[PDB]
């Protein structure tokens, strides 16, 4: 089960966050981890298209080379807090799994500046909650978490030490498709 007491950062700037560009997950903390261990890579691009907030997602497994995409229309619950009803698609936007009622994820932007951010996400699939996941994002895939994002991890009562880095993970990203899924 997830947490819904994640606090959106005060004075969160929507225009810079949803600029249509890519965010790399450089470090993450999964509270409910699988039995089998799988180290992932993930990136996302949040923007606007046709007048709606949109977020496209990318997950890459460096050990199997398996890759999946998702596109969702976002619904703002309160600035910095959003609900995403996702659909799994191919990189060209063809739908593999349609939008389903029990399928969504919500995320809170806990901290964000021009180059970094700390978010909380809760994945819900088939009316089954799947557990809290905290992620540190950066607009550059090689940058280490700075003092500001680290203070934000502390302020949410977490230990940055428990965070796992994707830096030495052999990650490969497909930004072109990420950005283009924004309109699908
Ligand atoms: C902001 C970052 C993330 C968001 C919003 C997010 C969202 C999601 C969504 C929507 C799915 C469902 C895919 C589908 O079936 O269509 C998913 C699945 C998955 N994600 Fe992520 N994810 C994020 C980061 C990560 C990271 C860094 C990891 C590593 C812990 C991860 C590991 C997985 C795995 C293993 C699955 C498959 C379902 C399971 O076994 O629980 N994701 N993610
Ligand atoms: O602008 P910062 O987050 O790199 O200090
Ligand atoms: N996840």
Curated annotation (Swiss-Prot):
Compartment(s) where it occurs, according to its Swiss-Prot or TrEMBL record: Secreted
Binding site for heme: 59
InterPro entries referenced in this protein's UniProt entry, alphabetically: Calycin (IPR012674), Nitrophorin (IPR023613), Nitrophorin_domain (IPR002351)
Gene Ontology MF term list: histamine binding; metal ion binding; nitric oxide binding
SUPFAM superfamilies named among the record's database cross-references: Lipocalins (SSF50814)
UniProtKB keywords: Disulfide bond, Heme, Iron, Metal-binding, Secreted, Signal, Vasoactive, Vasodilator
Disulfide bond entries: 2-122, 41-171
One term under GO cellular component: extracellular region
GO biological process terms held by the UniProt record: vasodilation
Principal location class: secreted
Highest taxon of source: Eukaryota
Tissue specificity of this protein: Salivary gland (at protein level).
Entry's family note: Belongs to the calycin superfamily. Nitrophorin family.
Function: Heme-based protein that deliver nitric oxide gas (NO) to the victim while feeding, resulting in vasodilation and inhibition of platelet aggregation. Reversibly binds nitric oxide (NO). Also binds tightly to histamine, which is released by the host to induce wound healing.
Protein name (Swiss-Prot/TrEMBL): Nitrophorin-1
Record organism: Rhodnius prolixus
